[PDB]
């Protein structure tokens, strides 16, 4: 999954 705040 993908980091939201980066």
């Amino acid at each position: 999954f993908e980091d939201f705040w980066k």
Partner: antibody
Amino acid sequence: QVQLVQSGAEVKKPGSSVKVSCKASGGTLSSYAISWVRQAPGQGPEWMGWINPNSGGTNYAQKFQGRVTMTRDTSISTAYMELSRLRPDDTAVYYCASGYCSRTRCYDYWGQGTLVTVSS
Amino acid sequence: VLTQPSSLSASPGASVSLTCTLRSGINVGAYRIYWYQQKPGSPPQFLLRYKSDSDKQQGSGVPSRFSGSRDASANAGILLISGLRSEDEADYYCAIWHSSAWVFGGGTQLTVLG
């Protein structure tokens, strides 16, 4: 991925410093970044930076460099944001937030916020 | 960098378009627009993010009547709310990653008439 619980309201004088905490409800923070966002009354959000809870590496917004410090405790249980040389215009609700995304959805985990009041 | 109308009002059941206008030069096609809803006393809650019909992500538990789109003509991202309800009354904020800082719009206060 985990719920975040913040510390209580703070009241400070100009020139002082405040340190807000952001503890994982469950004892351990996740690997995803913990961003810090503040919101002055009647205004919109303002990003301050984030920290990576495993590395401890930071990325501070330009407006707050030299004033803000973001750390983590050694058990990776709690994240901290420290702001120094406070001014009345630092008065705001300070939030921590973390989250992740599928390709279809996103899941944002916000703390309840911590009110920091700066006044003489 | 971002400009939102400070206030917007509409009737229940209406379809409303909330605009997030990016500064001249900053091309709207090269940014993924984030949208948040905030009610008094609560943190912002992520609604959705939109880059194209191809790459769009919906917030957890956010109804489908909230959708995203783009308006390249006006250099603006768009949050579409159909079937407007009284519970949609809130502040709506847009946001982008630009010059390695998260940038937020000033917010649109949405009032439901009647």
